[PDB]
Amino acid sequence: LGSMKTERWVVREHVEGVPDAARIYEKVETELNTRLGEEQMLLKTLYVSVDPYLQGICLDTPIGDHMGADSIMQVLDAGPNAPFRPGDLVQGFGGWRTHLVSDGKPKLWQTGTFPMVFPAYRKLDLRHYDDALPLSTALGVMGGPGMTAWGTMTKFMQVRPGDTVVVSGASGMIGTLVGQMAKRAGARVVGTAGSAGKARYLSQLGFDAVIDYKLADDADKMREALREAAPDGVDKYFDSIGGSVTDAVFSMLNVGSQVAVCWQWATQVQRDYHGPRLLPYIMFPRATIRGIFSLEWFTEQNWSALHEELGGLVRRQELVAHETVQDGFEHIPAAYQTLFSASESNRGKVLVRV
Amino acid sequence: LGSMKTERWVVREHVEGVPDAARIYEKVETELNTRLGEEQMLLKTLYVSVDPYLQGICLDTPIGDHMGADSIMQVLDAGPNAPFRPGDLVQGFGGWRTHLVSDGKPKLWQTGTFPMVFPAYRKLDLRHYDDALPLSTALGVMGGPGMTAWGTMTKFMQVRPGDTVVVSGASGMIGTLVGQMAKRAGARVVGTAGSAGKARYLSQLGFDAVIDYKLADDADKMREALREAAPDGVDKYFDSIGGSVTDAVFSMLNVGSQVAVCWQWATQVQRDYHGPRLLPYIMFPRATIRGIFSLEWFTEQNWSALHEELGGLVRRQELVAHETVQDGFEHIPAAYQTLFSASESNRGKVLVRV
Ligand SMILES: NC(=O)c1ccc[n+]([C@@H]2O[C@H](COP(=O)([O-])OP(=O)(O)OC[C@H]3O[C@@H](n4cnc5c(N)ncnc54)[C@H](OP(=O)(O)O)[C@@H]3O)[C@@H](O)[C@H]2O)c1
Ligand SMILES: NC(=O)c1ccc[n+]([C@@H]2O[C@H](COP(=O)([O-])OP(=O)(O)OC[C@H]3O[C@@H](n4cnc5c(N)ncnc54)[C@H](OP(=O)(O)O)[C@@H]3O)[C@@H](O)[C@H]2O)c1
Ligand SMILES: CC[C@@H]1C[C@@H]2C[C@@H]3[C@H]4C/C=C\C(=O)NCCC[C@@H]5NC(=O)/C(=C(O)/C=C/[C@@H]4C[C@H](O)[C@H]3[C@@H]2[C@H]1C)C5=O
Ligand SMILES: CC[C@@H]1C[C@@H]2C[C@@H]3[C@H]4C/C=C\C(=O)NCCC[C@@H]5NC(=O)/C(=C(O)/C=C/[C@@H]4C[C@H](O)[C@H]3[C@@H]2[C@H]1C)C5=O
């Protein structure tokens, strides 16, 4: 009847808007019972992801509980019917915890806005990873974010040569992957970034035009920047921002256009709940708008196609998937903070190697 | 060579909001030159359509111009290179005029909000019509509105047995037609209507619930009636109204739900331009939203299809395509006004026999 010392980051306090990592999260020591049920496993956390969607996960986490997050774990011990053996690497929602016990089965997010179901843990096979595509990429381009970009661009958006594609929130991993895929499919690609460096970075990834969303702060100034960046209209919009940039894009939708709603940062994070009605603007364009919830694509078939298609382009150097690996379980909230407010210096997926 | 006296309804004044049809329009005598260019035809108007979408056509029509509308016409006289011969019957955007000279070719709506192109005149064939499917159906179930409903239900929405289908604006020919096709695919069809007498007309047509949209002023009041009317949520939504009813339906979208946007009466007519941001409610449901602009389906193949699929069911009494034909050219604007003020007595498509 043993037990082990583990550390955990827990939700101290609920604060909406831009969260203040130093204030919401407290690092505690915790005794973990190492006694396993017949198909439970004891796991060690090797990497964790920090993502903006955690802001609204946290505001749904009971005070005192650990911060959920996507992670890479190694099995230390396992009961006789556990899905994985000791040594196996898994990707799943381990959280900001050094170690944990779980059977890796799918689990409801009880206190979520929706009845969301966190996926079963995914076995990672080392043959898929090398120095060009390290194991850590199971939290980025070979993970949720990659699956979001690749799934949208191959199961919904049909970018054609000549199209103008708008990507809001382009500086992040998903945005840059969508842009680079769109460019490969032959499109003019316009993005929004948040400073001259980031906008230059997107220009080095192949974006044809980059608009500063800090300068163009309202839909009118934003309408101006789009009309200059996209003079023939918008065929495809990959939206992570919402708000007044999305209001702007909807005024200039072309016929048969397609909008993918991946996130609404300006609503979720900036509490912008009311705005110009958008549906009156989509009838003549005959525009199709599809909500994106990439969990529906987490199948073994899609993960292989991901590693074939997307892993290939990354390895042949036809496609840049950049990540930023902060070291140290104790710097997890400092890494998370650098997503909001400190996006300067931040390229791609931010991970923490523990 | 020669001329003939005609009457025309012209736009004398622009009035926003709900139309004042007696203040907007003026009936004039107009001498038409009847000397025909080589592809021009002289046509005589048999029926005209009055529709809510005419409110926007009007506001885009220069003062003094004639009011455009959908009509059934008959070729009196035709140049040698005309597309049709005298005696031929055609459906086209002839307008509130007793006679006109046109060449039947597609025409750009110069002054539109959108660069829309009115279609070429479409020859009708009297063989195709009997007492069950009168010639006037070329302005209803065998015309515009019929092609809007049928096209949506066979080209976009995949209604499957067990769905809950919600139709805002259900009393008219389009909502009525959607519901009946949805019911034939196994759905539970919920609607809205404005009376008790139409509420009972829809139910008797096979609707399982009918909210009264006048009782339901609010997005709150509308959620409650919907929750009741559709307890398992919405999988399909045919929207003609927008506004607060649409804000309600978007709060209870099921997974893989489809929304088709037909009109936004609440914004177009009632001038409600702001509301809750709706896009942030579609991501988890993976809702698909498609603007409708049925002009895209006006193809020869699609008409023959519409005749055969619907003309069967309508004729065999399995599909109710009622119509309300007002008599008298001098009454066209009064018939148009009832769509907005006195619909309690209308049934299906409103036309005017000239
Ligand atoms: N529905 C789904 O299935 C799904 C799946 C995965 C992810 N998501 C969500 O979708 C988003 C996209 O992923 P990502 O990796 O591309 O995220 P991300 O870009 O890392 O999010 C932060 C970035 O967005 C930019 N940004 C911040 N505030 C902005 C604003 N108000 N207007 C415009 N841009 C702004 C910043 O660019 P600068 O650095 O240039 O300031 C920053 O680098 C994430 O927020 C994630 O939570 C949804
Ligand atoms: N996008 C396209 O391609 C396309 C093509 C054709 C038509 N449309 C539009 O689609 C709509 C449907 O066509 P239709 O022929 O069936 O017209 P309709 O529904 O007969 O239009 C007027 C009717 O709508 C109802 N109504 C008025 N205000 C309402 C409200 N606030 N909420 C709910 N219902 C309300 C009234 O019904 P009660 O008598 O029950 O009050 C009235 O009978 C029209 O708006 C039409 O212009 C679009
Ligand atoms: C173990 C795999 C992990 C599980 C994580 C759960 C993550 C998903 C859920 C994360 C947060 C959430 O659901 N917050 C409350 C709603 C706010 C807001 N409204 C939405 O509709 C929405 C999303 O729809 C997000 C989708 C994320 C997509 C992302 O890809 C998933 C992560 C995935 C990589 C929002 O954020
Ligand atoms: C000759 C065949 C005729 C040609 C007519 C032209 C009619 C179409 C045009 C009618 C009005 C219009 O274009 N008004 C300006 C936009 C306001 C508002 N925004 C929209 O996107 C919209 C429509 O999307 C309308 C679609 C109608 C659909 C209708 O069915 C067509 C008529 C059709 C039956 C709106 O109403």
Residue A157 near residue A151, CB atoms below 8 Å: no
A174 marked among binding-site residues: yes
Do A278 and A236 fall into the same domain?
A: yes
Rounded to the nearest 5°, which phi and psi values hold at A163?
Answer: -65, 145
For A208-229, give the DSSP string: SEEEETTTS-SHHHHHHHHHHH
Residue A246 near residue A270, CB atoms below 8 Å: no
Look at residue A266 and tell me if it is in a domain.
Answer: yes
* Burial environment of residue A134 by CB neighbours within 10 A (0 to 12, 13 to 18, 19 or more): middle
Specify the resolution in Å: 2.6
State the greatest distance between any 2 C-alpha atoms of chain B, in Å, as a whole number.
68
State the greatest distance between any 2 C-alpha atoms of chain A, in Å, as a whole number.
69
Q: Which of A174, A238, A339 to mutate to test the pocket of ligand 1 (most atoms within 8 A of CB)?
A: A174
Ligand 1, atom 26: closest residue by C-alpha:
A169
CATH code for the domain in which residue B11 is found: 3.90.180.10
Selected for mutation to probe chain A from B286, B288, B295, B296 (highest A CB count within 10 Å) is B286
Q: Choose among B221, B206, B224: nearest CA to B167.
A: B206
**Matching residue, tokens 């966190």:** A118
Q: Choose among A239, A231, A284: nearest CA to A266.
A: A239
At which of A294, A313, A332 does a domain end? A294
Contacts of A177 (CB under 8 A, 6+ apart): A141, A145, A146, A149, A150, A310, A319, A321
Residue B293 near residue B145, CB atoms below 8 Å: no
- CA-to-CA separations, B253 to A13, A260, B148, B149, in angstroms, rounded: 31, 17, 23, 21
A79 marked among binding-site residues: no
Rounded to the nearest 5°, which phi and psi values hold at A36?
Answer: -105, 135
Q: How far is the CA of B351 from the centre of ligand 2 (A)?
A: 14
At which of B291, B309, B329 does a domain end? B291
Do B176 and B275 fall into the same domain?
A: yes
As a whole number of angstroms, the distance between CA B271 and CA A347 comes to 44
Look at residue B131 and tell me if it is in a domain.
Answer: no
Residue B92 near residue B104, CB atoms below 8 Å: yes
Question: Residue B301: left (phi > 0), alpha (psi -120 to 50), or beta?
Answer: alpha
As a whole number of angstroms, the distance between CA B327 and CA B335 comes to 9
- Would the CB atoms of B277 and A288 count as touching at under 8 Å? no
DSSP annotation of B97 reads B
Rounded to the nearest 5°, which phi and psi values hold at A258?
Answer: -140, 130
CATH code for the domain in which residue A218 is found: 3.40.50.720
* Burial environment of residue B53 by CB neighbours within 10 A (0 to 12, 13 to 18, 19 or more): middle
Residue B32 near residue B101, CB atoms below 8 Å: yes
Look at residue B188 and tell me if it is in a domain.
Answer: yes
- Would the CB atoms of B279 and A268 count as touching at under 8 Å? no
Long-range contacts of B336-343 (CB under 8 A, 24+ apart): B336/B19, B336/B21, B336/B50, B336/B54, B337/B19, B337/B21, B337/B22, B339/B50, B339/B51, B339/B52, B340/B18, B340/B19, B340/B52, B340/B269, B341/B18, B343/B171, B343/B194, B343/B198
Do A17 and A107 fall into the same domain?
A: yes
Would you tell me how many other CB atoms lie within 10 Å of the CB of residue B76?
Answer: 15
Q: How far is the CA of B179 from the centre of ligand 4 (A)?
A: 22
Do B277 and B339 fall into the same domain?
A: no
- CA-to-CA separations, A68 to A92, B17, B88, B335, in angstroms, rounded: 10, 51, 71, 62
Q: How far is the CA of A75 from the centre of ligand 2 (A)?
A: 61
As a whole number of angstroms, the distance between CA B229 and CA B211 comes to 8
- Would the CB atoms of B286 and A272 count as touching at under 8 Å? no
Would you tell me how many other CB atoms lie within 10 Å of the CB of residue B302?
Answer: 17
Residue B188's identity, in one-letter code, is: R
Q: Choose among A7, A3, A82: nearest CA to A41.
A: A82
Half-sphere exposure of B147 (CA within 13 A, CB side): 20
List the Cα angle A296/B160/B191 in 5-degree steps. 110
Q: Choose among A112, A172, A147, A177: nearest CA to A292.
A: A147
Q: Choose among A172, A170, A120: nearest CA to A303.
A: A120
* Burial environment of residue A114 by CB neighbours within 10 A (0 to 12, 13 to 18, 19 or more): exposed
Cross-strand pairs, A83: none
- Would the CB atoms of A283 and B268 count as touching at under 8 Å? no
Name the H helices within chain B.
21-24, 54-59, 144-155, 173-184, 197-205, 219-229, 243-249, 265-268, 300-306, 312-315, 332-341
As a whole number of angstroms, the distance between CA B6 and CA B327 comes to 18
Residue B201 near residue B165, CB atoms below 8 Å: no
3-state secondary structure of B234: strand
Q: Quote helix, strand, coil % in chain B, to nearest 5.
A: 30, 30, 40
Q: Which of A137, A265, A271 to mutate to test the pocket of ligand 1 (most atoms within 8 A of CB)?
A: A265
Do A282 and A212 fall into the same domain?
A: yes
Look at residue A139 and tell me if it is in a domain.
Answer: no
In which element (H, E) is residue A88 found? none
Would you call A115 an interface residue with chain B, using a CB distance cutoff of 8 Å?
A: no
Residue A319's identity, in one-letter code, is: L
Do B273 and B348 fall into the same domain?
A: no
Would you call B285 an interface residue with chain A, using a CB distance cutoff of 8 Å?
A: yes
As a whole number of angstroms, the distance between CA A269 and CA A168 comes to 15
Long-range contacts of A342-345 (CB under 8 A, 24+ apart): A343/A171, A343/A194, A343/A198, A344/A195, A344/A197, A344/A198
Do A16 and A117 fall into the same domain?
A: yes
Do A235 and A172 fall into the same domain?
A: yes
B174 marked among binding-site residues: yes
Do A78 and A177 fall into the same domain?
A: no
Q: How was this structure determined?
A: X-ray
Q: How far is the CA of A30 from the centre of ligand 1 (A)?
A: 33
Q: What number of helices (H) and strands (E) belong to chain B?
A: 11, 18
Residue A43 near residue A90, CB atoms below 8 Å: yes
Name the H helices within chain A.
21-24, 54-58, 144-155, 173-184, 196-205, 219-229, 243-251, 265-268, 300-315, 332-337
How long, in residues, is chain A? 354
* Burial environment of residue B214 by CB neighbours within 10 A (0 to 12, 13 to 18, 19 or more): exposed
DSSP annotation of A97 reads B
Do B113 and B199 fall into the same domain?
A: no
Residue A313 near residue A96, CB atoms below 8 Å: no
First to last CA, chain B: 26
3-state secondary structure of A163: coil
Selected for mutation to probe chain A from B289, B295, B297, B298 (highest A CB count within 10 Å) is B289
List the Cα angle A166/A170/A175 in 5-degree steps. 90
DSSP annotation of B247 reads H
Residue A143's identity, in one-letter code, is: G
E strands present in chain A: 3-11, 25-33, 41-49, 71-78, 89-92, 99-102, 107-109, 116-118, 122-124, 164-167, 188-193, 209-212, 234-239, 253-261, 274-276, 288-291, 323-327, 349-353
Contacts of A181 (CB under 8 A, 6+ apart): A149, A150, A153, A159, A319
Do A117 and A11 fall into the same domain?
A: yes
Q: Which two tokens stand for residue A1?
A: 């009847």
Task: Kindly state if the Cβ of B162 falls inside 6 Å of ligand 4.
Answer: no
Q: Choose among B145, B163, B244, B266: nearest CA to B208.
A: B163
CA–chain centroid gap for B166, Å, is: 18
Ligand 2, atom 11: closest residue by C-alpha:
B240
In chain A, residues 205-264 whose CB comes closer than 8 Å to chain B? 239, 242-243, 246, 261-264
Look at residue A336 and tell me if it is in a domain.
Answer: yes
- CA-to-CA separations, B274 to A148, A275, A276, B76, in angstroms, rounded: 31, 5, 5, 49
Domain count, chain B: 2
Would you tell me how many other CB atoms lie within 10 Å of the CB of residue B327?
Answer: 11
As a whole number of angstroms, the distance between CA B203 and CA B190 comes to 9
B292 marked among binding-site residues: yes
Domain containing B342 equals 3-118+321-353
Q: Choose among B239, B285, B137: nearest CA to A113.
A: B285
Look at residue A290 and tell me if it is in a domain.
Answer: yes
3-state secondary structure of B238: strand
As a whole number of angstroms, the distance between CA B169 and CA A103 comes to 50
- Ligand 2 atom with the smallest distance to the CA of B261 is 1
Contacts of A296 (CB under 8 A, 6+ apart): B286
Long-range contacts of A23-26 (CB under 8 A, 24+ apart): A24/A58, A24/A333, A25/A67, A25/A96, A25/A332, A25/A333
Selected for mutation to probe chain B from A109, A244, A272, A277 (highest B CB count within 10 Å) is A277
Task: Kindly state if the Cβ of B119 falls inside 6 Å of ligand 4.
Answer: yes
Look at residue A229 and tell me if it is in a domain.
Answer: yes
Would you tell me how many other CB atoms lie within 10 Å of the CB of residue A187?
Answer: 21
Would you tell me how many other CB atoms lie within 10 Å of the CB of residue B315?
Answer: 14
Would you call B286 an interface residue with chain A, using a CB distance cutoff of 8 Å?
A: yes
Q: Which two tokens stand for residue A323?
A: 């990540």
How long, in residues, is chain B? 354
Residue A230 near residue A205, CB atoms below 8 Å: no
As a whole number of angstroms, the distance between CA B128 and CA B126 comes to 5
Do A287 and A148 fall into the same domain?
A: yes
Task: Kindly state if the Cβ of A57 falls inside 6 Å of ligand 1.
Answer: no
3-state secondary structure of A9: strand
At which of B269, B291, B313 does a domain end? B291
As a whole number of angstroms, the distance between CA B291 and CA B29 comes to 40
Look at residue A133 and tell me if it is in a domain.
Answer: no
3-state secondary structure of B31: strand
CA torsion sign, A300 to A302 to A306 to A309? positive
Residue A236's identity, in one-letter code, is: K
As a whole number of angstroms, the distance between CA B239 and CA A282 comes to 12
As a whole number of angstroms, the distance between CA B49 and CA B351 comes to 5
Q: Which two tokens stand for residue B56?
A: 């926007």
